Amino acid sequence: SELLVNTKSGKVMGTRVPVLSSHISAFLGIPFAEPPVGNMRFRRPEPKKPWSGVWNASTYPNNCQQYVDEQFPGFSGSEMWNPNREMSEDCLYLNIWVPSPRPKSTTVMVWIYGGGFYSGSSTLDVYNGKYLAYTEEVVLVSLSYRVGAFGFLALHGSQEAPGNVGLLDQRMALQWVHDNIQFFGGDPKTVTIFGESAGGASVGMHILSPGSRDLFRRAILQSGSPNCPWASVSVAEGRRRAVELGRNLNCNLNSDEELIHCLREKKPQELIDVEWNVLPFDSIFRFSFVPVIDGEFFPTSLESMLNSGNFKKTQILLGVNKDEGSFFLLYGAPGFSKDSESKISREDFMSGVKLSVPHANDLGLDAVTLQYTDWMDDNNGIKNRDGLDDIVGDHNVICPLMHFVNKYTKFGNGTYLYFFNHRASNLVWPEWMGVIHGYEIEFVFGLPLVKELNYTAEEEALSRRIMHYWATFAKTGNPNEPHSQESKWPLFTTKEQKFIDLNTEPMKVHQRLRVQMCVFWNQFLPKLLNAT
Numbered sequence: 035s036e037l038l039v040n041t042k043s044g045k046v047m048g049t050r051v052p053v054l055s056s057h058i059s060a061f062l063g064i065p066f067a068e069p070p071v072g073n074m075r076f077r078r079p080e081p082k083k084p085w086s087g088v089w090n091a092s093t094y095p096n097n098c099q100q101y102v103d104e105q106f107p108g109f110s111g112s113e114m115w116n117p118n119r120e121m122s123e124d125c126l127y128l129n130i131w132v133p134s135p136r137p138k139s140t141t142v143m144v145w146i147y148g149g150g151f152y153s154g155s156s157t158l159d160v161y162n163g164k165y166l167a168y169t170e171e172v173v174l175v176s177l178s179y180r181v182g183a184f185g186f187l188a189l190h191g192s193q194e195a196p197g198n199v200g201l202l203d204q205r206m207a208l209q210w211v212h213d214n215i216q217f218f219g220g221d222p223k224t225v226t227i228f229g230e231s232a233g234g235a236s237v238g239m240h241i242l243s244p245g246s247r248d249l250f251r252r253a254i255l256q257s258g259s260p261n262c263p264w265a266s267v268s269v270a271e272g273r274r275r276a277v278e279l280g281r282n283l284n285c286n287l288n289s290d291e292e293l294i295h296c297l298r299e300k301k302p303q304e305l306i307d308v309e310w311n312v313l314p315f316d317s318i319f320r321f322s323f324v325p326v327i328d329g330e331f332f333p334t335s336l337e338s339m340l341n342s343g344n345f346k347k348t349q350i351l352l353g354v355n356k357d358e359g360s361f362f363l364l365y366g367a368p369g370f371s372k373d374s375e376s377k378i379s380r381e382d383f384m385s386g387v388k389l390s391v392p393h394a395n396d397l398g399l400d401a402v403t404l405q406y407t408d409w410m411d412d413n414n415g416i417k418n419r420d421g422l423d424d425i426v427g428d429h430n431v432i433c434p435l436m437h438f439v440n441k442y443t444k445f446g447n448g449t450y451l452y453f454f455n456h457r458a459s460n461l462v463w464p465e466w467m468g469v470i471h472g473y474e475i476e477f478v479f480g481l482p483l484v485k486e487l488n489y490t491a492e493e494e495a496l497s498r499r500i501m502h503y504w505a506t507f508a509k510t511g512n513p514n515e516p517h518s519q520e521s522k523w524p525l526f527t528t529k530e531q532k533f534i535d536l537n538t539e540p541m542k543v544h545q546r547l548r549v550q551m552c553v554f555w556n557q558f559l560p561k562l563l564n565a566t
């Protein structure tokens with residue numbers, strides 16, 4: 035039966051789901067690792083022991099343990115990201131949407147969700163891959179991994195909690211796709227891993243990690259790169275935060291074994307309840323447990339790797355949104371409210387730049403402010419607000435990505451860059467947040483197609499363009515149709531620096547995406563902070 039597939043791990047029973055008045059197969063909740071429960075907490079992922087009998091892969095699995103967002107109870111704009119499945123440490127599973135009839139060897143796309151490495155679920159609605167699988171005729175796989183301390187606590191040196199296990203969970207899923215996607219009609223030699231936010235950063239991290247390069251063909255990163263200031267930490271920092279977490283639950287801190295044991299005896303929600311008390315600074319866009327530069331998963335500093343071309347060469351398709359910062363200021367910076375225009379004062383503006391650039395000393399905070407302030411109108415609430423919005427976005431998403439892309443292209447086999455700047459017509463967040471972090475996702479997964487979602491005709495059009503770009507890129511290594519009569523997406527070159535818009539208007543090509551502010555963020559401020 036089309037809904038029955040035999041994989042090296044065992045047989046699997048899927049289900050037929052309806053999609054835009056048609057149907058495709060869906061194998062939901064396939065296990066790709068042994069449940070990281072019990073003494074395996076913090077440990078590296080172990081291969082899911084094969085099973086005999088048919089596995090019911092007709093419904094979604096549990097979502098890993100994670101901090102749920104209760105900032106706006108009932109608000110759909112914030113809960114569409116909260117887990118919609120019973121949380122559980124036993125969450126390592128993957129989902130595959132398969133066209134019908136089943137292909138024989140089509141392009142495959144594995145999706146890695148975002149969430150600041152402390153949250154994320156493959157079962158969210160905007161992550162439903164039936165529309166993409168169906169529309170572009172591709173086998174869509176969305177994996178999952180351990181977020182938070184559960185997947186990132188890092189006591190370097192120990193084998194019980196080495197760290198980066200979350201990324202290992204990911205790789206394990208990628209290996210399972212390499213080894214079995216063929217039985218689902220997928221071409222294991224044409225897998226394109228794509229993610230957003232922490233997911234995009236992850237993608238870049240597999241491109242950098244030798245132990246992963248061999249497991250995928252192409253790569254797509256959205257609103258995030260491996261070198262983002264929040265994506266990784268040093269073993270030292272990671273260790274420090276581990277102890278702090280332990281100290282928060284009154285753990286014996288005499289040895290790693292003493293500490294690790296204590297953390298394993300704590301219920302999941304106990305670690306979650308104090309997770310945020312470990313950060314080193316009062317800051318915005320910073321998460322407790324994230325990938326550490328251990329020397330293993332990451333041979334050396336991400337920068338030297340980038341500089342020495344020590345990374346998988348291939349084609350990549352990445353980009354950012356116009357208002358990345360807005361979401362983190364609403365949640366932490368003083369002055370922003372979900373229900374107001376959030377006009378910011380010079381007092382609060384300053385406080386924002388403080389939270390935004392946590393590692394900066396006074397001179398640094400000064401440089402930033404000077405660089406993002408209209409002194410001919412230093413008291414404009416809208417300016418102070420948007421300026422702050424920009425700061426959070428450039429520093430944390432746009433500029434780090436631009437560094438990456440600039441460093442990669444110099445060794446890559448093709449680079450395509452996009453600047454997504456269309457605000458959905460159905461967005462329920464305040465107008466001031468603009469093109470919000472993670473809202474390009476819905477167009478990538480073609481939600482504008484299903485009418486009951488209330489998108490505009492053009493928005494549906496946009497979705498389809500994107501979906502095709504992504505798919506066509508995954509299949510070929512280029513987002514463009516071989517011979518076409520409509521708009522070429524220029525290749526990004528270290529010389530031209532060309533890039534494109536992604537909105538409901540006629541796409542237009544541009545150059546040097548936010549160079550100005552990124553020469554400051556990537557080249558100046560660093561020098562500044564180091565000299566001082």
Ligand SMILES: *[C@@H]1O[C@H](CO)[C@@H](O)[C@H](O)[C@H]1NC(C)=O
Nearest residue numbers: 047088089090091092093094
């Ligand atoms: C799992 O499969 C069983 C029969 O094999 C089916 O009745 C059930 O709906 C599926 N998922 C559920 C409800 O747990």
Ligand SMILES: *[C@@H]1O[C@H](CO)[C@@H](O)[C@H](O)[C@H]1NC(C)=O
Nearest residue numbers: 348349445446447448449525
């Ligand atoms: C990609 O690699 C192929 C073969 O190695 C080469 O012919 C082509 O010019 C490369 N393209 C880019 C953009 O580097």
Ligand SMILES: C[C@@H](c1cccc(O)c1)N(C)C
Nearest residue numbers: 115148149150231232471472
């Ligand atoms: C909170 C989170 C987020 C919020 C909204 C959409 C996303 O994809 C991710 N950041 C921190 C990674």
